[PDB]
Amino acid sequence: ELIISDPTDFEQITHVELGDSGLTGFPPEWREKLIKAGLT
Amino acid sequence: PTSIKLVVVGDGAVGKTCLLISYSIRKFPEDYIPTVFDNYVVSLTAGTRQIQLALWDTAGLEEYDQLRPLSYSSASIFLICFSVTSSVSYDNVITKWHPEVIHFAPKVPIILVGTKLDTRNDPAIVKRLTEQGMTVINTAKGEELKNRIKAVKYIECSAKTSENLKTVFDEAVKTVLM
Ligand SMILES: Nc1nc2c(ncn2[C@@H]2O[C@H](COP(=O)(O)OP(=O)(O)OP(=O)(O)O)[C@@H](O)[C@H]2O)c(=O)[nH]1
Ligand SMILES: [Mg+2]
Ligand SMILES: [Mg+2]
Ligand SMILES: [Mg+2]
């Protein structure tokens, strides 16, 4: 019975895409963010 | 404020990204760009409780199979997606996605999501499927998959029309907070 609002304050934290010259993304330390994310 | 981590997985092009974007910023992308890795955060209230909902978008393409598990740590909930007009994607829930998820996070609640609801009654789409020996996924066969993979809920929706879109995330927030 909880009332869930629509979302606000949308923010994109990390982004990775496939370029013709390997992966790129933001923020510049995205690779550190991925590996740190994979850690428990 | 409470943090919730949601992770979406499923075949390429089933509509995982459009699902997240349509829900969070009320826009439907239309162009298809395969995801490699994308992380978002939105703010919600559930009652008076302030919520940071982290949305982790993953790649459906098998090229990223060895990278995909980087998204799985400390998940609060998984959405496993298949398109109601792609029985191939439905089967892959069985052969790939459910096994992948439980291998890494066997105790994390899964909600099964049938995407592209709006396409099921598209006579032109049904043509394609019929002339190629494929079939539409009806709600009953959807609930069947949900029971088979011990998913907590099964929700059908359209990112294009927004039919039942909000419901997918309300239910996920509810499953986690309960
Ligand atoms: N008709 C209809 N088309 C949709 C819907 N959602 C997504 N699509 C279309 O299906 C295509 C795939 O959408 P995406 O959200 O990018 O697919 P995805 O699951 O994120 O794909 P990957 O990132 O490669 O794994 C896009 O061109 C969308 O326009 C929907 O609800 N209805
Ligand atoms: Mg995508
Ligand atoms: Mg593989
Ligand atoms: Mg677990």
Side-chain angles (χ1 to χ4, degrees), chain B residues 35 41 54 56 87 90-91 94 97 100 104 128 148 159 162 164 166 172 174 177:
Chain B
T35 303
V41 179
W56 290 63
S87 52
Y90 177 101
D91 294 333
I94 300 171
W97 306 110
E100 179 156 304
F104 293 96
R128 278 168 167 171
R148 179 172 180 170
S162 77
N164 289 319
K166 197 208 186 205
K174 284 163 172 183
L177 291 184

Side-chain angles (χ1 to χ4, degrees), chain B residues 4-42:
Chain B
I4 300 180
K5 169 167 175 177
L6 185 157
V7 185
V8 206
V9 309
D11 273 9
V14 293
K16 303 185 295 304
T17 301
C18 287
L19 184 84
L20 297 178
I21 298 296
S22 178
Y23 161 71
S24 38
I25 54 175
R26 343 212 103 201
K27 284 165 180 174
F28 181 70
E30 264 181 340
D31 285 338
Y32 172 45
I33 305 184
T35 303
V36 178
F37 197 104
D38 282 290
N39 278 4
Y40 314 93
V41 179
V42 296

Side-chain angles (χ1 to χ4, degrees), chain B residues 5-140:
Chain B
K5 169 167 175 177
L6 185 157
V7 185
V8 206
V9 309
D11 273 9
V14 293
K16 303 185 295 304
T17 301
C18 287
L19 184 84
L20 297 178
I21 298 296
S22 178
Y23 161 71
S24 38
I25 54 175
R26 343 212 103 201
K27 284 165 180 174
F28 181 70
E30 264 181 340
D31 285 338
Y32 172 45
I33 305 184
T35 303
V36 178
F37 197 104
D38 282 290
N39 278 4
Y40 314 93
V41 179
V42 296
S43 296
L44 298 171
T45 53
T48 55
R49 196 175 294 276
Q50 297 289 317
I51 307 289
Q52 296 300 118
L53 171 60
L55 304 162
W56 290 63
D57 203 354
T58 70
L61 297 180
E62 66 170 359
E63 290 93 286
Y64 306 102
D65 273 354
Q66 283 68 251
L67 289 176
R68 199 179 304 102
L70 297 179
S71 293
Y72 297 167
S73 297
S74 305
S76 298
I77 188 165
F78 280 79
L79 300 187
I80 299 179
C81 296
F82 72 91
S83 173
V84 296
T85 46
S86 173
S87 52
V88 168
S89 69
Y90 177 101
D91 294 333
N92 281 331
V93 169
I94 300 171
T95 60
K96 179 161 184 185
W97 306 110
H98 171 73
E100 179 156 304
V101 173
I102 63 182
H103 181 83
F104 293 96
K107 292 185 175 67
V108 177
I110 294 166
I111 292 182
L112 188 70
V113 178
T115 54
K116 302 180 180 182
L117 178 60
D118 64 296
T119 61
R120 190 152 65 185
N121 288 337
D122 188 324
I125 293 295
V126 185
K127 174 181 163 70
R128 278 168 167 171
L129 300 179
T130 295
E131 295 179 342
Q132 297 174 353
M134 301 170 309
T135 57
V136 148
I137 311 296
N138 56 87
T139 305

Side-chain angles (χ1 to χ4, degrees), chain B residues 150-164:
Chain B
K150 304 181 177 174
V152 172
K153 297 159 192 176
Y154 170 62
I155 314 182
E156 298 178 326
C157 67
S158 178
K160 195 183 179 186
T161 75
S162 77
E163 184 181 351
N164 289 319

Side-chain angles (χ1 to χ4, degrees), chain A residues 9-28:
Chain A
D9 301 310
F10 174 80
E11 182 169 354
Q12 182 170 16
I13 301 310
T14 312
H15 169 74
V16 181
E17 59 177 69
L18 185 56
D20 282 350
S21 21
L23 293 177
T24 61
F26 72 79

